[model samples]
Target: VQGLTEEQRMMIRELMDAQMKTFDTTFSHFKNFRLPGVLAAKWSQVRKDLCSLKVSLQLRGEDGSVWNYKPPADSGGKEIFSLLPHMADMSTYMFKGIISFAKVISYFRDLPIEDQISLLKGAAFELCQLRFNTVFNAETGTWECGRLSYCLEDGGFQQLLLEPMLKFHYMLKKLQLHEEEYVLMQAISLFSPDRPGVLQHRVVDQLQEQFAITLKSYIECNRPQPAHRFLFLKIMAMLTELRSINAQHTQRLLRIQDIHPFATPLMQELFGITGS
Candidate 1:
């Protein structure tokens, strides 16, 4: 930014603006239930049936396939209590959202294939953490997954990791970050150039700089008070904590895949769990 010309800065700003606009349009549905017109009773029944179906379907699939093939009647081992299908569905949605943003951020897409993959390797978990807030019920301390609730403590996964996840979400709720700010924070996290194996640090750094500037501009307009001066820094601190929680979750997920051979395709693709 120091040596960049006016036109260069302007172009970056425009790109960031367009990316934000696209994100807002794409994810507005995340803010509310889309089945508003359905009768409450009917919707409840549909949700019940869907959860029952997912549980049943999980029993009829190969390890790498989408469908959960039924296991042998006598095949017994440690039960994989994790909600494989729901987790996969959420992971897929998060992955797709990141891909869409990557497409618009020309620098991100233009990276060599290896660098692109490396970026995703490092950023995917954090991006998923950011998207987790969309379904998070901060007031009630639960995640609403299609009418089913997963209380953080009893989500049938690692309680230790889920504890931090719940705390981070609670902090986010306390901060009351506006949707635009939340989206901008996500973009900033995504364009990280310091990830261990990035090949083109300069390009990534420049893109992140642009996003940081745009976020500053947004805050200035929306939060024009002296007390908001260090807001971004505070959020950055939270992101650091989020990174640690994501690392633990990543480890927990790998363990889950080990215990449960029928890992989801999306989990396999993203985390490289071959289900061996």
Candidate 2:
């Protein structure tokens, strides 16, 4: 594997800037609803609050716009999963998420810059859910975002992510999802051609199946471990889970007025009811 050039790095930054602004809008939409302590137990309230908070950042991210790689200021930040009370730190995980996303999609085949953004918008929030899962502690209900302790809510909009997200990691951690395995799954999830408007999905569709086989191939004898038997089945199930989470998150974004300037014009074009 070769290293990335300036172009992809700047492209990752453009994606991050787009995400941060969307998060800013999401925060405003859910502003009045404050989160309380011990949020794991506050599932109902968490749902309502997250209902307001979990806007899919990808709404305006696609403009049929060619990739210009707009570099946002303060692009030096490289921390992943640091849960910024401000949108700054939150972008790290996305940068990391989409960075490798940019990397992996390259060697396999070349999709146009437009299709890359499409796949990204389709799976980014889901990828965010996956990225956050690394730091999340299911039993305790806390995300150890870069060694600082934060409840899903305390980190701001995370309470919304917490309640919906915990169920996934709860099952995932039990399976003890390991390293490269997680990366492979994330890749498979992102490569989905199943997203609504992607141009040449057969490439992604075929490539993703190849990824699945690689994962299952690895599981072959790391086996007799009991959980290993159905691990692939269970893991794939979470993708199913992710679909509804994305669907539900979009529902909230639709009702939110006073949305961020970047997201304002996008609401009508992308209604987001299709499965990915």
Candidate 3:
């Protein structure tokens, strides 16, 4: 961590604070949508709203492509192919979601085009996984869809990513995290400054530090337990583990796209695959 000048720190801090506040205000509905119990039905509305946001933000017709996939109740190998397209679509959406944030949008707009692409290429998957937390069912160790459940380990996907994804889920479940926490963590993931090839690493690092500070304040203000002080670090650790999974997942997706030429051009672009 290099020392940042006072002016440099102040400028980045102001942007970070504004972006964080915007995020907090924009997604507050998630906190309100949660019901009082653990029943799946109780969370239906919450899940719907969150999923809507996820899909809307991540998949906003970036490549002029439309995907309407409905997995059959008893489909196997055929339906399994659906996952890659779905993931690719959502991954693009996730990248768009990050850049769409108020301050982030401005931040990237001013950057060199190559730098923008580099940062996005490195951070897209991590940000996508952060958004996926909304659908995660910690109790069941699966993604809780209305009628279909998805486990990371199923469909013979790459085991390296699956194991870490499962471990990350279990670790996060232990925290009994809230929607606000999830939102903040997603921002933290977005503002990550350490991604390879980033041009303004120090600036992004400063922004990430501010997000970390805000997350701590949130925990302190909302959770009365003194023991909860360490909760931030625990969540950060889980995010670190998740980043590893994201790398593996990216490689697996690339391999899948290579083996199956059926992947759409949009999917290839989203995954950074270089081919027609």
Q: What is the C-alpha RMSD of each candidate to the true structure, in Å?
A: 11.2, 14.2, 11.8
> lDDT of all predictions, in order shown?
0.59, 0.51, 0.54
Give the higher-TM-score candidate: 1 or 3.
1
Cα-lDDT of candidate 2: 0.51
Ranking by TM-score: 1, 3, 2
Task: Report how far residue 220 has shifted in candidate 3, in Å.
Answer: 3.0
The alpha-carbon deviation from the true structure for residue 20 of candidate 1, after best TM-score superposition, in angstroms, is: 7.7
- Pairwise TM-score winner, candidates 1 and 2: 1
- Name the regions of candidate 3 deviating beyond 4 angstroms: 1-83, 86-112, 145-162, 262-266
lDDT: the better of candidates 1 and 3: 1
Highest TM-score scorer:
1
* lDDT per residue (tens digit) for residues 156-262 in model 1: 33332335766687777667677656766776777789876888899889877877776666666667677678787777788788778767766666654543444
For model 1, what is the alpha-carbon lDDT of residue 230?
Answer: 79
- Against the true structure, candidate 3 has what lDDT? 0.54
Error of 3 at 196 (Å): 2.4
lDDT of 2 at 154: 27
